[PDB]
Amino acid sequence: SSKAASLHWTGERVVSVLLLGLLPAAYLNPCSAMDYSLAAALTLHGHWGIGQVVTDYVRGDALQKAAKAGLLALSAFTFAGLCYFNYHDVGICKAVAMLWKL
Amino acid sequence: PRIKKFAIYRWDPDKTGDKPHMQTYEIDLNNCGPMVLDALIKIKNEIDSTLTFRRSCREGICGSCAMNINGGNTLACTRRIDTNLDKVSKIYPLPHMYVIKDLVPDLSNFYAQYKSIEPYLKKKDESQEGKQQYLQSIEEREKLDGLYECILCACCSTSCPSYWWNGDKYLGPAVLMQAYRWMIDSRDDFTEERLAKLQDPFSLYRCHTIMNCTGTCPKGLNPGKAIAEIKKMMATYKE
Amino acid sequence: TTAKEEMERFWNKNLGSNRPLSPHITIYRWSLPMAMSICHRGTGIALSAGVSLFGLSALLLPGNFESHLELVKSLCLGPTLIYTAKFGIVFPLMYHTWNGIRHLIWDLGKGLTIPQLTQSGVVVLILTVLSSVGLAAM
Amino acid sequence: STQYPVVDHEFDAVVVGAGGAGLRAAFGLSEAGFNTACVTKLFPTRSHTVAAQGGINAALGNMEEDNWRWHFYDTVKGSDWLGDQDAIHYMTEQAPASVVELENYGMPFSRTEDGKIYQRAFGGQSLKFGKGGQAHRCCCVADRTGHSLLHTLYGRSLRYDTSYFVEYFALDLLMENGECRGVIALCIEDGSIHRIRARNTVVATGGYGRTYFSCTSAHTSTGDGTAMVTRAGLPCQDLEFVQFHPTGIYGAGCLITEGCRGEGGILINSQGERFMERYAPVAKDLASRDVVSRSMTLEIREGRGCGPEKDHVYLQLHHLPPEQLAVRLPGISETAMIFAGVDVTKEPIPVLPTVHYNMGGIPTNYKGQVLRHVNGQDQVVPGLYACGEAACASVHGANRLGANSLLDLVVFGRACALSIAESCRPGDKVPSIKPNAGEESVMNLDKLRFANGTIRTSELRLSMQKSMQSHAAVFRVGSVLQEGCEKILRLYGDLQHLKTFDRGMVWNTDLVETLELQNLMLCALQTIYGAEARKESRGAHAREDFKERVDEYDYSKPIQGQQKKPFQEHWRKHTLSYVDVKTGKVSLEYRPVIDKTLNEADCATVPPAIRSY
Ligand SMILES: *Cc1cc2c(cc1C)nc1c(=O)[nH]c(=O)nc-1n2C[C@H](O)[C@H](O)[C@H](O)COP(=O)(O)OP(=O)(O)OC[C@H]1O[C@@H](n2cnc3c(N)ncnc32)[C@H](O)[C@@H]1O
Ligand code: HEM
Ligand SMILES: CNC(=O)c1ccccc1I
Ligand code: SF4
Ligand code: F3S
Ligand code: FES
């Protein structure tokens, strides 16, 4: 008799207001610490976002599980991929900074 | 003399292989009442008696008209004909529904969804009912304004794209509003378990706040406002 | 006859019948509120598609980030043509950000009336255009 | 006939109708553990009681000291002594209980400073037996009392296992040897035919407002149950007694609530006069419905009409504070704007007397049992009940009081259910029906389905609607009634000359409305013939040849020093009406009004007196 659906919803809005917290917080004062938390929020908010589109349009239980798992993989690779970029390359902030200097 | 043309959706179930099409009817607006139903009844009585639709009150309180006039859902009996003769009126059955014949859809699923939320007052102690009038303050009663007035016309649920795609498992605005109507009714004892009933991905949470519902309502009621409000409670209720 | 039994019988009847489905998007009228929710999906979808591409290529493609930027410099840099790709990147991001705030404001219970939708919606659009022309200029 | 599939069903009880009456009777039977079917040609919520506005009378006394016995007096006084006082006792005695039951069901009644049900002033109701001044017992959910009534009733109906036949059109009663065994009905969806047999049958189909050209009632108010009883050979009572509501909008004829008048709304002529003060000085525009409209209709032929055609009258709300219209009368405030384009807060509504309610209907016990007329005496029809507007326990007699039919509904629906529960048990032998039985009703369906006549269904409907509107209006004369009679008879001759178009089984409304025409015609015939036969003016029925109230005595002077009249020399008696379906001839009889109450000690018989407001 859990409250798993409403906790999901409140979690979504949390990270939503948190990502909206980080976008200005990244331009003002960019650092190592900010790059990882941006990767966190970015892929998470993103993952749960696609989750909704999947549940809306992907009809039938057979395809529903596959899309979810397929998305889980695409997200897990996206997060780790950004964290790699953060440790072993320039980082999200400075990468944008360079892109805008062009 | 003023001739207005009407493009109406048609499908006979008893005709072999006759699929859906539009039929045009031409009406003189001088011998016809101002509303869209007045027209449908007029063509029924003078041009074609095969035209099939639901109607009862012609006052806008029964919810029988419930069709898609010129792009949106409303009640025919309460909507006035656009006096612009250069335009052609497009009349459709309510969006994303199985058509029985012409403008009559199968609302039985919708009805069943209303049935599942328990649209009646529930008390913990049922033993004392029928003998005393319950107490509700005038402030408490005003919470039901804009909520109780619903006429179950299904215009809003039938305008909701979430109801289009997931009408099987998504309850829709019409029904969701009524759950809220019973939630904030002071005399109701089952608030917590009425909310617990919505604890899944589809029942309530297919609303992405598209707000088509409130925009289409014939009664000026605000379904989305209630959905919004329902979600708030779902997040904040205890144990 | 419970509510759950009524529904199983509705779907059993209609799918097994030659009844057509009544047209929906093909006929339903375009309103600003609707068109702005559709765009919110697309921006959201497109934006994740970019974050996925950026992260996925950080794992698959050879060389560092600068290496890739020097390849951008090499493809005969357009003057204003660089301000375009910069605007095309930032336009959906800004739109989705502002409208996202609008969604959060609805999630609180505020501004959910037909007049308030037309206003707040129009405000978003103006805010998108201005912060899009603004950011690309930095 | 072998083209139609016949599906046979078995139940303990059938309720034909799903209005307030229908529902309350339908789940009343299920609460009491009967396997119950409810047949309805519309979805329950779409029924007419939805259109109900003003309220439901109960002597709860939340605004002042009240007594149900005072309610009683007013109702029999309203009925112009044609109301059967034993049913009027039962109904008022039961009201405070029956209304509380609805509020406990979850009806969102408007509220008082204390938090009790808000009651409103309504037409023809008084304290202290007519000498204590205006009473306030009209319980209300704003301007939408019936809508809320129906939805909470329907809300409740869902708790029980009642089997509903939604959008099924009942054709005829299943009659075998003067006993009723159920109904044969059409399934509108797949076009099939269903015999639903049961030990008891409740008719709750509501009235027949659609017999007229101008009526506040819905399109589907076609007296379908009334016709079935007519075809059964059983009598109908007081059908000539048709109530005109004073305040129907000049346009689509929709009902503006009498609640307007109680809340302080005033009726005005072309010269600005509050004309009701000239007519009824004491009760004013809050008088009886028969009396108020009578005065209105009269002002018009005198040149005091309000429109460009000088044919309507103004209902004014202009003077009342806007918040009062907002909380009390929002429902009419919208429909006034929708149809008449009026801002009640600024301008007065064009209103007009229009056909509204049918006090006559199906003869009934105070309990609910349908009566036939045998040897001048009352006799119960086995297995048959009737409640609400379709019925005639004659709790309203010659004129109905405001907010009294909604009570009627909920009170007798309930009574029908107890009266069945007390008489028998569920699981009792469901009486078996002939293999052929219902044959004739399908024969009729089929004939109309392939009709190839010269007169379109709607052309013959409009002919009747207009003819009743001009030959059986508020005022009538011998001449005009006679001319109406042989006109409605000519139209019943034309019933076999009609044209239909739709040959399909599925949702053939063409056919369904043609069945409704057959029903409406049988209703009209009895209404107009009984009206021509009644040579007196009582309540709604107003003759200009016989404007005197003709009772067994001259009750306008000291009783009992006087010669009593023979039964067939006065009109203080019920019109029972029959019709031979083959030729449409209306033969008609009479039965006496019940003067004694259920308990003289609790509720004294109110003798006839001078009736004025
Ligand atoms: C017209 C009107 C009447 C009215 C009113 C407002 C309007 C616009 N406001 C009232 C009020 O405020 N207070 C009050 O006391 N009365 C008021 N009235 C009158 C009142 O509403 C009616 O007397 C009463 O509501 C009638 O309801 P009832 O339950 O008796 O019947 P119904 O509501 O009309 O519904 C009839 C049902 O029967 C079914 N039916 C009919 N024929 C068939 C056949 N052929 N086969 C199967 N079913 C049938 C219908 O489907 C319907 O459900
Ligand atoms: C900080 C700025 C942002 C805010 C405030 C924000 C807010 C929101 C909100 C509230 C929703 C839910 C809308 C609904 O109720 O249906 C949403 C949807 C979504 N967001 Fe964001 N968002 C932001 C940025 C982003 C970014 C950068 C991405 C890219 C990864 C993204 C991806 C998505 C996706 C894929 C959806 C699902 C679309 C839908 O369901 O309609 N968002 N956003
Ligand atoms: C076209 N309408 C949709 O399908 C939609 C658009 C945006 C958000 C949610 C949805 I369910
Ligand atoms: S909220 Fe409005 S549109 Fe929705 S069912 Fe109720 S009356 Fe119809
Ligand atoms: S349109 Fe549908 S998704 Fe929403 S707020 Fe109304 S229910
Ligand atoms: S017909 Fe009753 S609402 Fe349109």
Side-chain angles (χ1 to χ4, degrees), chain A residues 52-82:
Chain A
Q52 305 286 359
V53 188
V54 166
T55 52
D56 277 320
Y57 301 132
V58 182
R59 292 286 302 177
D61 48 35
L63 268 166
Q64 184 87 289
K65 74 168 175 215
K68 276 285 143 55
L71 152 74
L72 187 58
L74 199 142
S75 295
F77 269 98
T78 301
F79 177 73
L82 294 177

Tab-separated table of all heavy atoms in Angstrom, chain A residues 52-82:
chain	number	residue	atom	x	y	z
A	52	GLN	N	7.989	9.319	-19.128
A	52	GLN	CA	6.602	9.747	-19.359
A	52	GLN	C	6.174	9.583	-20.815
A	52	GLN	O	5.084	9.082	-21.089
A	52	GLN	CB	6.387	11.199	-18.919
A	52	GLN	CG	6.775	11.507	-17.472
A	52	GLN	CD	5.795	10.966	-16.438
A	52	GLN	OE1	4.779	10.362	-16.771
A	52	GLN	NE2	6.106	11.188	-15.168
A	53	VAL	N	7.030	10.009	-21.740
A	53	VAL	CA	6.759	9.864	-23.169
A	53	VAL	C	6.602	8.382	-23.535
A	53	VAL	O	5.699	8.021	-24.303
A	53	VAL	CB	7.866	10.510	-24.029
A	53	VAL	CG1	7.479	10.516	-25.502
A	53	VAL	CG2	8.165	11.926	-23.546
A	54	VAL	N	7.471	7.536	-22.973
A	54	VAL	CA	7.389	6.084	-23.150
A	54	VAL	C	6.037	5.562	-22.659
A	54	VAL	O	5.291	4.958	-23.431
A	54	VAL	CB	8.569	5.345	-22.454
A	54	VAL	CG1	8.300	3.843	-22.334
A	54	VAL	CG2	9.866	5.582	-23.208
A	55	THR	N	5.711	5.824	-21.393
A	55	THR	CA	4.450	5.355	-20.807
A	55	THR	C	3.210	5.886	-21.525
A	55	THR	O	2.174	5.222	-21.538
A	55	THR	CB	4.337	5.664	-19.290
A	55	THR	OG1	4.601	7.047	-19.056
A	55	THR	CG2	5.314	4.828	-18.482
A	56	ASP	N	3.319	7.076	-22.117
A	56	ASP	CA	2.221	7.684	-22.875
A	56	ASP	C	1.993	6.996	-24.212
A	56	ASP	O	0.879	6.575	-24.518
A	56	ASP	CB	2.489	9.171	-23.129
A	56	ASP	CG	2.088	10.055	-21.963
A	56	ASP	OD1	1.029	9.812	-21.347
A	56	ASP	OD2	2.828	11.012	-21.674
A	57	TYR	N	3.058	6.880	-25.002
A	57	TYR	CA	2.940	6.414	-26.383
A	57	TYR	C	3.198	4.923	-26.622
A	57	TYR	O	2.607	4.344	-27.535
A	57	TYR	CB	3.826	7.251	-27.312
A	57	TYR	CG	3.503	8.727	-27.321
A	57	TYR	CD1	4.513	9.675	-27.195
A	57	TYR	CD2	2.188	9.176	-27.451
A	57	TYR	CE1	4.226	11.034	-27.198
A	57	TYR	CE2	1.889	10.528	-27.455
A	57	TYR	CZ	2.914	11.452	-27.327
A	57	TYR	OH	2.626	12.797	-27.338
A	58	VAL	N	4.068	4.307	-25.824
A	58	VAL	CA	4.436	2.901	-26.044
A	58	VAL	C	3.365	1.938	-25.517
A	58	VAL	O	3.324	1.618	-24.323
A	58	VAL	CB	5.829	2.560	-25.466
A	58	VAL	CG1	6.194	1.115	-25.765
A	58	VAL	CG2	6.883	3.492	-26.038
A	59	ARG	N	2.509	1.477	-26.428
A	59	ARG	CA	1.340	0.683	-26.069
A	59	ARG	C	1.672	-0.794	-25.926
A	59	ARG	O	2.443	-1.350	-26.711
A	59	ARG	CB	0.225	0.877	-27.103
A	59	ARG	CG	-0.396	2.283	-27.128
A	59	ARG	CD	-1.307	2.534	-25.927
A	59	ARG	NE	-2.388	1.549	-25.844
A	59	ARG	CZ	-3.293	1.501	-24.869
A	59	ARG	NH1	-3.267	2.380	-23.876
A	59	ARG	NH2	-4.234	0.567	-24.887
A	60	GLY	N	1.079	-1.426	-24.917
A	60	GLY	CA	1.295	-2.846	-24.663
A	60	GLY	C	2.416	-3.090	-23.675
A	60	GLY	O	3.456	-2.432	-23.733
A	61	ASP	N	2.199	-4.047	-22.777
A	61	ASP	CA	3.163	-4.403	-21.727
A	61	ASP	C	4.485	-5.001	-22.246
A	61	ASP	O	5.547	-4.772	-21.652
A	61	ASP	CB	2.515	-5.333	-20.687
A	61	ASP	CG	1.745	-6.494	-21.318
A	61	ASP	OD1	2.177	-7.014	-22.373
A	61	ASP	OD2	0.705	-6.896	-20.750
A	62	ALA	N	4.410	-5.755	-23.347
A	62	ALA	CA	5.584	-6.362	-23.983
A	62	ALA	C	6.637	-5.327	-24.394
A	62	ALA	O	7.809	-5.449	-24.035
A	62	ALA	CB	5.159	-7.193	-25.183
A	63	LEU	N	6.205	-4.315	-25.144
A	63	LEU	CA	7.071	-3.223	-25.580
A	63	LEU	C	7.411	-2.239	-24.457
A	63	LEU	O	8.458	-1.588	-24.494
A	63	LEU	CB	6.409	-2.453	-26.723
A	63	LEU	CG	6.667	-2.810	-28.186
A	63	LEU	CD1	5.625	-2.121	-29.058
A	63	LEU	CD2	8.078	-2.417	-28.618
A	64	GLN	N	6.513	-2.124	-23.477
A	64	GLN	CA	6.675	-1.196	-22.349
A	64	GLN	C	7.943	-1.488	-21.537
A	64	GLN	O	8.694	-0.569	-21.207
A	64	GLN	CB	5.435	-1.235	-21.444
A	64	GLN	CG	5.434	-0.246	-20.275
A	64	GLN	CD	4.876	1.121	-20.644
A	64	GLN	OE1	5.508	1.883	-21.376
A	64	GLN	NE2	3.693	1.440	-20.125
A	65	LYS	N	8.174	-2.767	-21.226
A	65	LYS	CA	9.350	-3.181	-20.458
A	65	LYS	C	10.649	-2.991	-21.250
A	65	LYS	O	11.669	-2.564	-20.693
A	65	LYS	CB	9.209	-4.630	-19.961
A	65	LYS	CG	9.382	-5.714	-21.030
A	65	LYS	CD	9.512	-7.110	-20.419
A	65	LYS	CE	9.551	-8.183	-21.496
A	65	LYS	NZ	8.863	-9.417	-21.043
A	66	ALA	N	10.591	-3.298	-22.549
A	66	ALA	CA	11.745	-3.197	-23.444
A	66	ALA	C	12.212	-1.752	-23.591
A	66	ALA	O	13.400	-1.459	-23.432
A	66	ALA	CB	11.419	-3.799	-24.807
A	67	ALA	N	11.264	-0.859	-23.883
A	67	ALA	CA	11.545	0.570	-23.999
A	67	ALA	C	12.170	1.100	-22.716
A	67	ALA	O	13.169	1.807	-22.772
A	67	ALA	CB	10.277	1.345	-24.346
A	68	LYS	N	11.592	0.736	-21.572
A	68	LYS	CA	12.108	1.147	-20.262
A	68	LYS	C	13.559	0.712	-20.035
A	68	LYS	O	14.407	1.537	-19.665
A	68	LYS	CB	11.214	0.623	-19.131
A	68	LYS	CG	10.003	1.492	-18.835
A	68	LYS	CD	10.395	2.766	-18.085
A	68	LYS	CE	9.557	3.965	-18.522
A	68	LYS	NZ	8.101	3.695	-18.388
A	69	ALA	N	13.830	-0.577	-20.264
A	69	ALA	CA	15.175	-1.132	-20.139
A	69	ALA	C	16.117	-0.493	-21.151
A	69	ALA	O	17.223	-0.074	-20.802
A	69	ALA	CB	15.146	-2.644	-20.312
A	70	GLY	N	15.663	-0.410	-22.401
A	70	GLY	CA	16.413	0.252	-23.469
A	70	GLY	C	16.756	1.693	-23.137
A	70	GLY	O	17.837	2.174	-23.471
A	71	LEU	N	15.831	2.377	-22.473
A	71	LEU	CA	16.055	3.741	-22.018
A	71	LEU	C	17.008	3.768	-20.820
A	71	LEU	O	17.889	4.632	-20.743
A	71	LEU	CB	14.721	4.427	-21.691
A	71	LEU	CG	14.696	5.538	-20.642
A	71	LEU	CD1	15.300	6.829	-21.174
A	71	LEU	CD2	13.278	5.754	-20.151
A	72	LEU	N	16.831	2.823	-19.895
A	72	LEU	CA	17.709	2.718	-18.729
A	72	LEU	C	19.172	2.637	-19.155
A	72	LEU	O	20.030	3.313	-18.579
A	72	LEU	CB	17.342	1.502	-17.868
A	72	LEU	CG	18.049	1.320	-16.517
A	72	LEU	CD1	17.840	2.538	-15.611
A	72	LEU	CD2	17.574	0.051	-15.822
A	73	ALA	N	19.443	1.818	-20.171
A	73	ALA	CA	20.788	1.677	-20.719
A	73	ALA	C	21.287	2.980	-21.338
A	73	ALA	O	22.410	3.405	-21.066
A	73	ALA	CB	20.843	0.536	-21.731
A	74	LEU	N	20.438	3.613	-22.150
A	74	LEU	CA	20.776	4.877	-22.810
A	74	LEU	C	21.049	6.005	-21.810
A	74	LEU	O	21.893	6.860	-22.059
A	74	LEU	CB	19.680	5.280	-23.803
A	74	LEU	CG	20.022	6.309	-24.891
A	74	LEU	CD1	19.348	5.944	-26.209
A	74	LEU	CD2	19.660	7.735	-24.472
A	75	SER	N	20.340	5.995	-20.683
A	75	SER	CA	20.593	6.945	-19.602
A	75	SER	C	21.885	6.633	-18.845
A	75	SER	O	22.711	7.522	-18.641
A	75	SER	CB	19.417	6.993	-18.627
A	75	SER	OG	18.244	7.490	-19.249
A	76	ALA	N	22.060	5.374	-18.436
A	76	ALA	CA	23.236	4.957	-17.656
A	76	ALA	C	24.543	5.214	-18.400
A	76	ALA	O	25.555	5.546	-17.785
A	76	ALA	CB	23.121	3.503	-17.258
A	77	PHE	N	24.506	5.070	-19.722
A	77	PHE	CA	25.648	5.386	-20.577
A	77	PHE	C	25.848	6.884	-20.720
A	77	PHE	O	26.980	7.354	-20.832
A	77	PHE	CB	25.476	4.768	-21.963
A	77	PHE	CG	26.066	3.396	-22.091
A	77	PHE	CD1	25.262	2.266	-21.979
A	77	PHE	CD2	27.425	3.229	-22.331
A	77	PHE	CE1	25.801	0.995	-22.103
A	77	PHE	CE2	27.974	1.960	-22.456
A	77	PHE	CZ	27.162	0.841	-22.342
A	78	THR	N	24.741	7.623	-20.728
A	78	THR	CA	24.782	9.080	-20.833
A	78	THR	C	25.390	9.700	-19.577
A	78	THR	O	26.277	10.542	-19.686
A	78	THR	CB	23.393	9.678	-21.141
A	78	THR	OG1	22.905	9.130	-22.370
A	78	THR	CG2	23.460	11.201	-21.276
A	79	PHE	N	24.936	9.268	-18.399
A	79	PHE	CA	25.494	9.756	-17.129
A	79	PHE	C	26.984	9.449	-16.983
A	79	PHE	O	27.784	10.357	-16.768
A	79	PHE	CB	24.716	9.219	-15.922
A	79	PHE	CG	25.298	9.630	-14.591
A	79	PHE	CD1	25.170	10.940	-14.132
A	79	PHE	CD2	25.970	8.708	-13.795
A	79	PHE	CE1	25.708	11.327	-12.902
A	79	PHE	CE2	26.511	9.082	-12.562
A	79	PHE	CZ	26.379	10.396	-12.114
A	80	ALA	N	27.348	8.172	-17.108
A	80	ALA	CA	28.747	7.746	-17.009
A	80	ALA	C	29.624	8.440	-18.050
A	80	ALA	O	30.782	8.776	-17.776
A	80	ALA	CB	28.855	6.247	-17.144
A	81	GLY	N	29.050	8.660	-19.236
A	81	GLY	CA	29.722	9.349	-20.335
A	81	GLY	C	30.050	10.795	-20.028
A	81	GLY	O	31.078	11.310	-20.467
A	82	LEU	N	29.173	11.447	-19.273
A	82	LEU	CA	29.392	12.832	-18.864
A	82	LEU	C	30.381	12.905	-17.713
A	82	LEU	O	31.211	13.811	-17.660
A	82	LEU	CB	28.078	13.504	-18.467
A	82	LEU	CG	27.021	13.731	-19.551
A	82	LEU	CD1	25.777	14.329	-18.924
A	82	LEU	CD2	27.540	14.617	-20.675
